[PDB]
Amino acid sequence: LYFQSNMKIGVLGLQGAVREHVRAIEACGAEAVIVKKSEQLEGLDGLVLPGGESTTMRRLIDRYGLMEPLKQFAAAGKPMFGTCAGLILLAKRIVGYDEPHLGLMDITVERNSFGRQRESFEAELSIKGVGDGFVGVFIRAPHIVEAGDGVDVLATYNDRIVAARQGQFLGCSFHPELTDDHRLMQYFLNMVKEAKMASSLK
Ligand SMILES: [Cl-]
């Protein structure tokens, strides 16, 4: 008989702080799973990394022993979407105080707190392969300082990279979950579907 074809997408974070991420994932017809424990990663097709304060990330990763399991998840080819500070977890290099980063994307990132006194703002963005008129909500947005040749730039703001992709990794410095525009989440879910397709065949 038949099984569900719904993708299972994890959200790395605490129950009450990731409601908007759950909603964005579910709005696209995927099942959201709040991930705390590393075993919960095994059944997922993809993972959203919302991030949070550096100290909370440090504690969460250490307390739940997520570092190797996260690296394992990447090695299985499962797509991962870092948003806002979650982008830092995917980076190779950090400018400023050191914090958890897995070295998955060829980018150098810097926390907002380190750069300047940038007040939160909203800007219309043109996202390559996703669409125009996407409202990017920048609240405590990290800065992507540099990106290597293998990184696909999807959007810029004031010539700074604000959305990028490298293989199964997707990253943005804004909060796509704070708009009802589902085009970026759909783009990610498409990556997850393609990756699942591929794993099934070889
Ligand atoms: Cl910015």
From Swiss-Prot:
GO terms for cellular component: cytosol; glutaminase complex. SUPFAM superfamilies: Class I glutamine amidotransferase-like. It catalyses: aldehydo-D-ribose 5-phosphate + D-glyceraldehyde 3-phosphate + L-glutamine = pyridoxal 5'-phosphate + L-glutamate + phosphate + 3 H2O + H(+); L-glutamine + H2O = L-glutamate + NH4(+). GO terms for biological process: glutamine catabolic process; pyridoxal phosphate biosynthetic process; pyridoxine metabolic process. Pathway: Cofactor biosynthesis; pyridoxal 5'-phosphate biosynthesis. GO terms for molecular function: glutaminase activity; pyridoxal 5'-phosphate synthase (glutamine hydrolysing) activity. Its EC number is 4.3.3.6, 3.5.1.2. Signal peptide: none annotated. L-glutamine binds at G52, E53, S54, R111, I139, R140. Pfam families: SNO. The keyword Cell division does not apply. The keyword Lyase applies. The active site is at C84 (nucleophile), H175 (charge relay system), E177 (charge relay system). Keywords: Glutamine amidotransferase, Hydrolase, Lyase, Pyridoxal phosphate. Catalyzes the hydrolysis of glutamine to glutamate and ammonia as part of the biosynthesis of pyridoxal 5'-phosphate. The resulting ammonia molecule is channeled to the active site of PdxS. HAMAP family: PdxT. In the presence of PdxS, forms a dodecamer of heterodimers. Only shows activity in the heterodimer. Belongs to the glutaminase PdxT/SNO family. This is Pyridoxal 5'-phosphate synthase subunit PdxT.
